[PDB]
Design a protein around this ligand. Sequence first.
Ligand code: TA1
Ligand code: GTP
Ligand code: GTP
Ligand code: GDP
Ligand code: GDP
Ligand code: MG
Ligand code: MG
Lengths: 431, 436, 437, 428, 48
Amino acid sequence: MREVISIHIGQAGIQVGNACWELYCLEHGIQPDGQMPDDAFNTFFSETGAGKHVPRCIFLDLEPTVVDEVRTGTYRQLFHPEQLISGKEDAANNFARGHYTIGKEIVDLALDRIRKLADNCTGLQGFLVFNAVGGGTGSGLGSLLLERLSVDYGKKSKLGFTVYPSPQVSTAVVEPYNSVLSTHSLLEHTDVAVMLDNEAIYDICRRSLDIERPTYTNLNRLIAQVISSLTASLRFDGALNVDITEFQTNLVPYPRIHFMLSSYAPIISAEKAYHEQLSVAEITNAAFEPASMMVKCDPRHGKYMACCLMYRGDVVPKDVNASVATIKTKRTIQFVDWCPTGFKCGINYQPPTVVPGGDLAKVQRAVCMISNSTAIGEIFSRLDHKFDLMYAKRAFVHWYVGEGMEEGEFSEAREDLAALEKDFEEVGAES
Amino acid sequence: MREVISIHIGQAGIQVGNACWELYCLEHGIQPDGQMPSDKTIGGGDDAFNTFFSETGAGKHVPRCIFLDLEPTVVDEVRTGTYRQLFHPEQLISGKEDAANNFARGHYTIGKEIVDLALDRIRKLADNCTGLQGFLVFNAVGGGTGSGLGSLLLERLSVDYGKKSKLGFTVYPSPQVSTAVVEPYNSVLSTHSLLEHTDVAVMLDNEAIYDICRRSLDIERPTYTNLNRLIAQVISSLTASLRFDGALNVDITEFQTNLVPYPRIHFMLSSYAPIISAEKAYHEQLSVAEITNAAFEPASMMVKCDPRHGKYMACCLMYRGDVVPKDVNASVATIKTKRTIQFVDWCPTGFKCGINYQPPTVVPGGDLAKVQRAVCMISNSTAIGEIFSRLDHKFDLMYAKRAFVHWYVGEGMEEGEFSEAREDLAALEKDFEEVG
Amino acid sequence: MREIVHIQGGQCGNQIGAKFWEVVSDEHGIDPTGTYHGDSDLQLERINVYFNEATGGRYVPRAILMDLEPGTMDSVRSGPYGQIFRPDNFVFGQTGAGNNWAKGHYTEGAELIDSVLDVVRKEAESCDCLQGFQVCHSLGGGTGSGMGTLLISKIREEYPDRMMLTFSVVPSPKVSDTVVEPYNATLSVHQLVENADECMVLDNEALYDICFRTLKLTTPTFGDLNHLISAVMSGITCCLRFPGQLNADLRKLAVNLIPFPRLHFFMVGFTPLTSRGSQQYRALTVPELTQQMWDAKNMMCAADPRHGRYLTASALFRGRMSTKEVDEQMLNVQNKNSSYFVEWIPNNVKSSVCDIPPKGLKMSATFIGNSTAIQEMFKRVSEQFTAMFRRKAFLHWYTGEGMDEMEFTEAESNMNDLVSEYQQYQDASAEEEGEFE
Amino acid sequence: MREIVHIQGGQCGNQIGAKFWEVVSDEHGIDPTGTYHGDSDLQLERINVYFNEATGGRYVPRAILMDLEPGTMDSVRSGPYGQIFRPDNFVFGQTGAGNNWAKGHYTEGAELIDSVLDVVRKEAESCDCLQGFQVCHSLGGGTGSGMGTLLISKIREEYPDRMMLTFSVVPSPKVSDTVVEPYNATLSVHQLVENADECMVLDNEALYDICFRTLKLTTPTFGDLNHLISAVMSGITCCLRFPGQLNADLRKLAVNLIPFPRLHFFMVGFTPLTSRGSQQYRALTVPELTQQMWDAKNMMCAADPRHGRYLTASALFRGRMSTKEVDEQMLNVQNKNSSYFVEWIPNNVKSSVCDIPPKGLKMSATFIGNSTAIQEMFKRVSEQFTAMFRRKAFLHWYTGEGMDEMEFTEAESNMNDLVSEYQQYQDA
Amino acid sequence: SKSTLSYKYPAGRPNPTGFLKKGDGEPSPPQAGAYKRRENPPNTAFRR
Ligand SMILES: CC(=O)O[C@H]1C(=O)[C@@]2(C)[C@H]([C@H](OC(=O)c3ccccc3)[C@]3(O)C[C@H](OC(=O)[C@H](O)[C@@H](NC(=O)c4ccccc4)c4ccccc4)C(C)=C1C3(C)C)[C@]1(OC(C)=O)CO[C@@H]1C[C@@H]2O
Ligand SMILES: Nc1nc2c(ncn2[C@@H]2O[C@H](COP(=O)(O)OP(=O)(O)OP(=O)(O)O)[C@@H](O)[C@H]2O)c(=O)[nH]1
Ligand SMILES: Nc1nc2c(ncn2[C@@H]2O[C@H](COP(=O)(O)OP(=O)(O)OP(=O)(O)O)[C@@H](O)[C@H]2O)c(=O)[nH]1
Ligand SMILES: Nc1nc2c(ncn2[C@@H]2O[C@H](COP(=O)(O)OP(=O)(O)O)[C@@H](O)[C@H]2O)c(=O)[nH]1
Ligand SMILES: Nc1nc2c(ncn2[C@@H]2O[C@H](COP(=O)(O)OP(=O)(O)O)[C@@H](O)[C@H]2O)c(=O)[nH]1
Ligand SMILES: [Mg+2]
Ligand SMILES: [Mg+2]
C-alpha cells in the first residue's frame, strides 16, 4: 500500500541508483539474485509467484556502455530487462539532442513501462527522480519525461534529487546552458527539488571520512544513506511517521520556491565513532552546521523558511524538542519573519544500515536535515552570471540551433531565471 | 469417444504436421517410438490420448493423422526422421509427380487419381472411431497441392459425411512477403471451392507471425520451423477441452454454432498470449488481466489485418493453466468498456469463454518459455474483408493481360472458372459490407 | 413419505448437482462410500426424502443425471462423492448439444427422452408419497435449456398433481458466457411459465460480489459459487427433513408465495455470510440474520429490489431460537419500508423455522422474495433478443433443426406479456380509482 | 445501559487509543485474547460501557479506528493488544493525508464518510441506552484535524441529544511539530466552537514537563505520555463503570462546568505522580491529592491558571476515603487564594468519588478545570496564524482543494471573539 | 441502513462554498410505466 517508483536518468542517475539498490537489497536481506533466504520490501519491490523480489525501478539512459555493465554485473538477476532502457546513440552533452532529437523516440517505451510498473501498485506515493543537471541526456530527457509525467498523472508527487552543476569543479564547458534550460523546463512540473553538489560532498568526504581520493562511489554511498533515511518512515515503524505529501506540503511555501538544501549527521570514520559519543544535540548541531551542507551554499547568507528532520535510531522526542529549542535560541540561525513555526520532525526506530566494505561507521543516531533557505539565490546568481558571460558572444549556440532548437529558448530561460532570483529576493524581504 | 481426424496437405500442411505431432506426443509423454515409457507415467488421465491416437493390441499408440502430398521429397523425410516408428506407413501418402504451383494440376489432372486412395484411408480411419467430432484440415493456400488437391478433397468429404464438421487452419498469402508469383490465382481458385465445403476456416499469415517472432520473442533468425511451433501452441490450446478437464468445456460443435453468424462468414482471425522468452518469463506474474489485453492487441494478430478498421462480430477465449472464472468475467468486462474495440450492434454478447486446468506444454530446445497462464483468442471480425480485397486487386491486375493462364487452361481448365471464382469474392466482399 | 426425486441438467446443473449431494450427504453424516456414520437418529428419521436404502446399510441418492457429451459425467464419477450414484442413473448421449436450443430440444433431445422417462418412472414408484420434483438448469447452453424444458413438459403431463421446482441459472446482465445466449434464454421462458410451479433465478454475477465483498474471498472458484447454491438448495427442504416448531412444506411455501399462476419467478439469498476473520467476533442473533437477509446485495439474482416492490417474501430460519423475535422483526421491516411492499396484501411475509441448524453453525436463515423488480431481467434479455433477431444473426442454425420464425416471435411476445403482469401489479393500489386519474 | 462509542482519528489518535484500550482492558482483567480473567464480579457489571459480548466469552471494544494511509494501523494491528479489535472497525484510505487540513476535510475525508457512518451507526444501535461519543485528536495534522471535525458535524446532526467529548491534543507554543500547524489549528477550532460539547486540551510540551519535573523520568517515550493521557481518560468514566458514594455521570459533569455554550475548553491533570524514589517518603492522603492537583504544574496543558481565574472546576477521586476531607479541602482552597476564583459563582467546584481506585493504587484523583487562562492558547495561535496568512504563505496548498478564503478569516474571527468572552468574565 | 432496516437517501458530500460560519446554535421506488402511453411512431406497414 506504501509504494513508490524510482527513475534514474542519465549516467549519474544510474551511478547513484546502483548504490541505492545495493543498499536496499542489503537492508532488506535481498540477495543479488532477486530472492531472500511482508510490507517491508513492498515499498521498493514486487514478489513473483515464488520468492523472487524484482525492484520497482527504472534505469534510463542513451549510452549502452553503462547499462551493459549493469546487465553483466552481479545485479543482473534483479531487474526485469525491460526496465533497463538504453539507446543506440547518446545526447553528447547537448540539451537540444536530449530534448528534441533523441529522447522523443524512447519516451513512448519509457512511458508504457512506467504504466506497466504503476499498474501493479495499489497505493502509489510518488515519483523519485534521480537526475544530473549538466549533461544532455540527464537534463533534456528528464525535462521531457517530467512534462509527460505531469500530463499523465498530475495529482502524484514528484521529488527530484538533482546533482547540480558545480561552481568550480566541473567536467564540462557547455553545462551553464543546459542547466538553465533544464531549470526553465522542469520548474513548472517537479513538485519538489533537492539540490546537491559534487564539490560539497567532496569537501565532506575530505573533512569527515578522512578519505582523500573518492572515485564517485563514496558520493553515491552518501546519497544512498540520505534516501534510506528519507524513506524509512515508509517501510519502518517508529513514532512520528512522515510520508511524501506531508514532506512537500509544509516545506514548499510558494509555487516557485521548491529547491532545497540537504545535510546529514553524523558522518564519521570507524575510529572517530569508537572515540566519540554522538548525542542527539551534537547530531542536530552538526546537521545545522553549514559545513555539513551537501550543496555549495552558505546558509548564513540568508534566512531559513522551513526545515525537515528525520531522526533514526535511539532518539527520544523530548531530546528532539530540546535540541530544536536550543537551535531556535541560538543567534547565528536566522528565520524569515513570516514563519514562527518552521520544523517538521520525524522519528524512526530503525538505525541507519552499514554496507560491507563501506566507509561509514556503525552508529545508533542519525539525522537527515532538509531545509528551504533563501540563500540559493546565490547559486542561481552564479549560474545566471555564467550563462550570461557565455551567451553574450553566442558561444556554442550553433550546436543547439542545429539540433532542433532556436534562439528564443535562451531568452525565455534567462528571463525565467531572472524572475526566479527576484522571487527569492522578494518573498524573503520583510515589512 | 471424442476423436478428430487430422489431415495435412501440401508441404506447409505436413511441415506443421511435424510440429503438432511433435507436441502431442510430447504432451502425453509418448516417445517417438509410439510407446509409453511405462516406468515414469506422467499422464494424469487415461484414454485422453484417444483424441489423437489409437492404442494397438499391445502397448503402441498410433496417431490418427494422414500426411498427404504429391512431392515425395518431403514425405520421404518423415519416413527417415525420428518420427518414423509412429505413423502407419499406409497413412503417409505420396505421388510420383508434383502439382508444381498449379491449381489445375492439383485439382484436375493429378489429384483425381489419388483421392480414391486417400478417401479409403479416411474410411478405415473413421471406422475405428466411435464418436468423431470432426476433421481438422491443414492447408497452405497458394500451392498446387495445397489448394488444388485440398479443395478436391473437401468436396469428396462433404458428399460422404456432410453432417460432420470440417475445420481449416489454412495459411494465407501475405500482402508484402510472397514466396511465389502465381499465388494470387490459385488462392482465389481455392476459396471458391472450399467455401461451400468447409464449416469454419481459421486463417493465419506467414508475415504476421514473423513480427510476433521479432517483437515479443526477439528472434533475429526466424524460420518456418519457428513459425510452425506457434501453430502447435494454438491447436494445443484449442483442442485442450477435448482431451482435458476444466470448467467451461468447449466442443467443436459448441465452438461452431456461436461463432459463425451467417453461412458464409466464417473467416476468423487468431491470437495467442503470452509469447515471451525464458528471461522475461520469471520477472513477472502474468495476471489474467494483462494476458487478455495482449490477446486483443492488433500486433498479436496472426493475420496482416487491422481489426481497428472494423468491428467484432464475436470472440472466443480459450484460457489455459490456472485461471479462475472471476478474472475472465472481470477482465472481459474491462474490454467492453474500451473504445478502440467495437462490436456490431446486432451482438450485445460476443464472448464464448473457456477454461482448462492443463497448462501449456513447452518443447525442450524451443523458443517459448514455460508459463502457467495462456490465452488463445479466436475472433470473427468484419475488418477481415480487407485482406480479401488485396487478392481481388492482384487477381484483377494480372488477369487483364491473362498472364500464366496458358498453364491452367493447358491442364484441363476453362477460362470460365477464372471469372467463376471472381464472382464469389466480389460477392463475398459485399457480404462483409452488408453486416456493417 | 414426502419423497423428492432430483434431476441434474446440462453441464452446470450436473456440476452444482455434484456439490448439492455433497452437502446433504454430509448433513446426514453419510460417507463417500454411502454408509451412514452420523450420530443422531434424526439423520435417519427423514433420510428417505433424498436417498434409497440399499443392501449392507448404504444410502444411494434419488438423483438423475442427464447430459449429452458424457465427458462431464466422467467428472462427477471421479469426484470425491462420485461413487454413491447408481450408475444406471447416468443417461448420456455420445453427440454434443452445441449450445443450440433447437437440437437440444428437437433432434438430440427426442432421442433420449424415451430413455430418461423410463428412469424417472423407475424411481417414481419407489416412492410411496411423492412430494415433488426439482431440476437444476443453466438457461445458457443447449442441454440445460433444450433438454431441460423438453423434460419438464414430459413430467408435467405424466405427474400433473405433483410440483416442480427449478434452480435455473440465468444469463448475466453485463457478461455473456455464450454468444447465442439471448436466443436460448427466451425460448426456454416460454416453457417455464406453463410447466413449472416454482422457479428460483440465480446469476453468476451477483455470486461474484457476494464472494467478493461479503465473503471477502479473493479467487472464488466454481467450487465456491456452487457451494453457495447448494446451501440454499438445502435451506428449502429443512422442514421436510428435520423437525420444526413451525414447519413449511414445499406446497405451503408456494401457496403463500404466488398469488397469480404466472408470477412464479423468485429471488433467493442466504444468511449468515461472513469471513473467517469477522466470524471470531459476530454474535449470531435473529437481528443479525434479519438485517443481512433483507439487504439488496444478498439477493443472488441480479435484480435490485429498489426498482420494484415486494409482492411477498419468505424466511426459513433454522436453529433453536425465539419464535416471537422473528415474528416482530419481519413486522418492523414491513412498517419502516412500507412503500416497497404492496398494499393490497396486508401481511406479505411467511416465517418458518426448523429446530436443526446447519452442521457447523448455530443459527441460519434463507430468504425467498417474489419481487416486481425481476422484470428488469426480462427487459434486458428481451432487448438483446430483439437486437439480433431483427437482423436474424445466428439464426440459420436454429432453422437447421426444423424450427421456423413464428416460434421466435411467440417466445418474445410470451415475455412482454409476462413483463406487463409485473408492471400492472407493481402499480395497482387497493382502490380501483387512483390508477386512472 | 450508559454505553459509550469511541473514535480514534489520525496518527496521534490511532496511537493514544493503543494505550487507552490497554489501560481499560487491564482494569477489567481481560486479556489480549479478549477473554475475561479478572477476579471480582465488579468488572463484569459495567463492562458493557466499552465492550460487546462475543462467541466464546470474548469482549471486543466499541472503538472505531479511522485514518488515511493505514500504515500506523499496521503497527497497532501488530502490537500486543492488537488482536482484540474487530477488523471491520478499521477504516482507511489508500492515499495519504499530507498534513493538509483541506484534503483531510474536503476531498479525501468525504470519500470515507460514506463508509465511516455505516460503522458508527451499526454500533450505536447495539447500545440499548447510548450516553455519548468521545474522540481523540491532534490539531496539527490533516487526518486527525480534518477528518476529525468532518466526522463530528455528521455526528452532531445525526445524534444531537447525545454528548461529544474531544481529548484534542493542541499545538505546542515553543516547538512546532509541523509548519502549517496554525492553519490546521484554527480551521479545526472553528469546528469545535459549534460542534463540541466538551473539549479537553492537551499539549505535548507540558506533558514533557510533568514527565521529568514530577515523574523525573530519563528517556520519556510517546508510549509513556500515552500512559498519562490514558490515565485521565480512564479517570472520567469511573463513575460510569464503578459504584461510588457520590457518583458523577458524564452529562452532569458538563452542566456543572460550562456556564455559557461556547466555553467548552478545559484543562486536566492527574494525581498522584511520584518518582520511583519519592514513593518512599511521600504519604498518600487526601491533603496530598488536593495540593498536587490544584498546583499549576499538573495542568497537562501549557496554560498557567495563575494568569487567569477559574470559572468552575471538578475532581474525580477514586478509592475508599472520607467524604468530608474532600468537601472541606476543595472549600479551603477557594477561600485561601480567593484571587483566582470568580465571585458570581460562590461554590465553583464539583466533587465526585469512586470506591474503586486504579488497579495498582489505593487513592487517586483526576482534575478538570475551566479557567480563563485558556485564552492564552488562542492568543499565541492567533498571531502565528496572522503572521503567515497576511503574507499568503503555504496557502496555495489549501486553495488546491477548492477552499475559499473567508473560511480562513471566519475561522479566525470566530477565535478572536472567543478570546474576548474569556476576558469579560475575567474581571481580574 | 443495516442499523435501522430502512432505505434512506445518502448524505450530502461537503462543498467548499457551503462552509460553516460564526453562528451555529441549532423514499418510494421508481414507479413503472404501467399506464403510461407508449410511443406510437408512424412506422406502420399500412402507411407504407
Ligand atoms: C469454524 C467455523 O465455524 O467456521 C465456519 C465459518 O467461519 C463460516 C465463515 C462459513 C465457512 O464457509 C466459507 O468460508 C465459505 C466459502 C466459500 C463459499 C461458501 C462458504 C465454512 O467453510 C462453512 C462451514 O459451514 C458448515 O459446515 C455448514 O454445515 C455447511 N456445510 C457445507 O457447506 C459443507 C462444506 C464442506 C463439505 C460439505 C458441506 C452447510 C450449509 C448449508 C447446508 C448444510 C451445510 C462453517 C460453519 C465454517 C467454515 C468451514 C469455515 C460460512 O459458510 C457457511 C455455509 O456457513 C461462510 O459464511 C458462513 C459463516 C461461517 O461462520
Ligand atoms: N555524485 C555523482 N555525480 C556524477 C557521477 N557521474 C557523473 N556525475 C556528474 O554528472 C554530470 C554529467 O552527467 P551525465 O549523466 O554523465 O551526462 P548525460 O546526462 O548522460 O548526457 P550525455 O553525456 O550527452 O549522454 C557531471 O557533472 C558529473 O560530475 C557519479 O557517479 N556520482
Ligand atoms: N508457416 C509456414 N508456411 C510455409 C511453410 N512451408 C511453406 N510455407 C508457405 O506455403 C506456401 C507454399 O505452399 P506449398 O505447400 O509449398 O505448395 P503445395 O501445396 O505443396 O503445391 P506444390 O508446390 O505444387 O507442391 C508458401 O507461401 C510458403 O511460404 C512452413 O513450414 N511453415
Ligand atoms: N455457478 C456456476 N455456473 C456454471 C458452471 N458451469 C457452467 N456454468 C454456466 O453454464 C453456462 C453454459 O451452459 P452449459 O450447461 O455449459 O451448456 P449445455 O451443455 O448446452 O447446457 C454458462 O453460462 C456458464 O456460466 C459452474 O460450475 N458453476
Ligand atoms: N501524546 C502523543 N502525541 C503525538 C504522538 N504522535 C504525534 N503526536 C502529535 O501529533 C501531531 C502531528 O499530527 P499527526 O497525527 O501526525 O497528523 P494526522 O495524521 O493528520 O492526525 C504532532 O503535533 C505530534 O506531536 C504520540 O505518539 N503520542
Ligand atoms: Mg552522459
Ligand atoms: Mg508445394
